[PDB]
Design an enzyme around this catalytic site. Structure first.
Site, PDB file in Angstrom:
ATOM      1  N   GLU A  31       0.772  -1.257   0.117  1.00 46.05           N
ATOM      2  CA  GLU A  31      -0.087   0.061  -0.305  1.00 46.05           C
ATOM      3  C   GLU A  31       0.936   1.374   0.085  1.00 46.05           C
ATOM      4  O   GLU A  31       0.588   2.313  -0.486  1.00 46.05           O
ATOM      5  CB  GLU A  31      -1.113  -0.049   1.189  1.00 46.05           C
ATOM      6  CG  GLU A  31      -2.050  -0.997   0.908  1.00 46.05           C
ATOM      7  CD  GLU A  31      -2.789  -1.660   2.161  1.00 46.05           C
ATOM      8  OE1 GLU A  31      -2.380  -1.141   3.310  1.00 46.05           O
ATOM      9  OE2 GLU A  31      -3.486  -2.659   1.928  1.00 46.05           O
ATOM     10  N   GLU A  77       3.700 -10.825  -0.457  1.00 44.06           N
ATOM     11  CA  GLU A  77       2.079 -10.583  -0.759  1.00 44.06           C
ATOM     12  C   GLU A  77       1.918 -10.111  -2.108  1.00 44.06           C
ATOM     13  O   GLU A  77       1.929  -9.084  -2.421  1.00 44.06           O
ATOM     14  CB  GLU A  77       1.680  -9.496   0.230  1.00 44.06           C
ATOM     15  CG  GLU A  77       1.970  -9.619   1.681  1.00 44.06           C
ATOM     16  CD  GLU A  77       1.196  -9.013   2.588  1.00 44.06           C
ATOM     17  OE1 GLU A  77       1.120  -7.530   2.423  1.00 44.06           O
ATOM     18  OE2 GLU A  77       0.409  -9.409   3.560  1.00 44.06           O
ATOM     19  N   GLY A 123      -6.474  -7.786   0.010  1.00 40.34           N
ATOM     20  CA  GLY A 123      -7.699  -7.184   0.526  1.00 40.34           C
ATOM     21  C   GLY A 123      -8.699  -7.588  -0.619  1.00 40.34           C
ATOM     22  O   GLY A 123      -9.720  -7.044  -0.656  1.00 40.34           O
ATOM     23  N   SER A 163      -4.871 -11.973   1.554  1.00 37.94           N
ATOM     24  CA  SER A 163      -6.183 -12.736   1.839  1.00 37.94           C
ATOM     25  C   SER A 163      -5.850 -13.821   2.451  1.00 37.94           C
ATOM     26  O   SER A 163      -6.996 -14.930   2.459  1.00 37.94           O
ATOM     27  CB  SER A 163      -6.973 -13.015   0.348  1.00 37.94           C
ATOM     28  OG  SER A 163      -7.418 -11.686  -0.206  1.00 37.94           O
TER      29      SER A 163
END
Lengths: 255, 255
Positions: free
Chosen positions: A97, A169, A175, A215
């Protein structure tokens, strides 16, 4: 060549004071064996509230980010010194992010990690490719580049790599509910392991922990956790829920 | 056409838990009249410690930064919701360290401010030109551009501008000891005031508060504070010291 299982919960930008108190208390009430590392990363403004609520002798509180300078004129930024003054051992660096939405560069992530590692912290260093990068067949190229930036800062330092936990990730899994298959995840982790062998040699490589995120939840973690190179998880959404404790249990009985 | 004096202390990336406790207690012990606004902005990890140490009925705690989204998947970022849940009214937005060192764009600063203002916060919105920009005769062009970005987000909204405090800090004056002369500062503030008249009209303009920052301290603040368009100060280095209280007193007896 064995490694301690690791699970981290990244709360991201979520929570109120009451939620932090109640949720940290709930996690702390859970049985956590001494055989696994369990950390949770509240938002910066919530760290001291989380520490006060954490009655567990195992659970550790982590920060979600840290800056690449010491104390000084860095408005809005947290130093490693501040985190250590609060008693924290762990920090997340390079979350996708921050890399993809907020412009944190590969070099910036690497310099943050180096500074934290030099001062004695454990760094959860995040890497991952986007859907488009995977479509263009650049998955390993991208992940390796992010790691290479860290390697440029750390070199082959034994001391520095010791407290690195890599978190792979896939960005397309963060998400989105689109969790990687055990085959997709293990394939990347094997690639990263091979990279470590080349950079720090075989012995150094055998102790670097690599966790999966994107997730991961209470229902899908078991099969992933069975993969030899998946040493645990970085958990976003599920870390805000009671199923986080289920994941702790599963990681424990699996590894 | 009168405006309440305002002084803010930006601690930037400084402090330990013990320092926050002791320094907030010292400021809180000082007599603060109800006629002036006094705020201090500790680092994010220190906000709750500062709030607990703040026994003053006047002193307010502010944040140094906030993000432009609500709660969600924004690792390392704080939402307005979090700040309001902690009881905070004030936030610094667009500090030049974030704009110039950390790549916060004019639009990003503007969108942060808009979101905070919409939710009811008071925003200390920072603008300022660099030495090179002033040398190139672009001082007003730069400051106006930063304000125009805010104006694009806020339009002519009465509600939104009401709780804006503009902080003009020449970048060449931040942390350098090179404080602006009263003539240099007042000249820019008059330019900003004229801009406000054009954007929100005369009445709206009469109540916008504009404070000066950039090496303001206990020894040099009086003459600056005497300028009609300097409604107070944003104080960095001196806010970490006992002279911050001297500045509170001076602003009080001057304005």
């Amino acid at each position: 060549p064995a490694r301690r299982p690791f699970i981290g919960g990244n709360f991201k930008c979520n929570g109120s004071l009451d939620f932090i108190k109640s949720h940290v208390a709930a996690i702390a009430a859970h049985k956590i064996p001494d055989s696994v590392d369990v950390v949770i990363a509240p938002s910066a403004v919530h760290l001291s509230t989380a520490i006060a609520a954490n009655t567990s002798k195992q659970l550790r509180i982590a920060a979600q980010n840290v800056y690449l300078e010491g104390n000084g004129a860095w408005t809005g930024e947290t130093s490693v010194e501040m985190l250590q003054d609060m008693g924290l051992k762990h920090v997340i660096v390079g979350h996708s992010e921050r890399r993809r939405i907020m412009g944190e560069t590969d070099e910036q992530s690497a310099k943050k990690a180096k500074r934290a590692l030099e001062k004695g912290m454990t760094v959860i260093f995040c890497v991952g490719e986007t859907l488009d990068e995977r479509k263009a067949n650049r998955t390993m190229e991208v992940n390796i580049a992010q790691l290479e930036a860290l390697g440029k800062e750390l070199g082959e330092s034994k001391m520095l790599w010791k407290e690195v936990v890599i978190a792979y990730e896939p960005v397309w899994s963060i998400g989105t509910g689109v969790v990687a298959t055990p085959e997709q995840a293990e394939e990347v982790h094997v690639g990263l392991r091979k990279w470590f062998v080349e950079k720090v040699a075989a012995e150094g490589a055998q102790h670097i922990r690599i966790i999966y995120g994107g997730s991961a939840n209470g229902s899908n973690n078991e099969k992933l956790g069975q993969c030899p190179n998946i040493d645990g998880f970085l958990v976003g959404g599920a870390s805000l829920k009671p199923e986080f404790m289920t994941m702790i249990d599963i990681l424990t009985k699996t590894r």
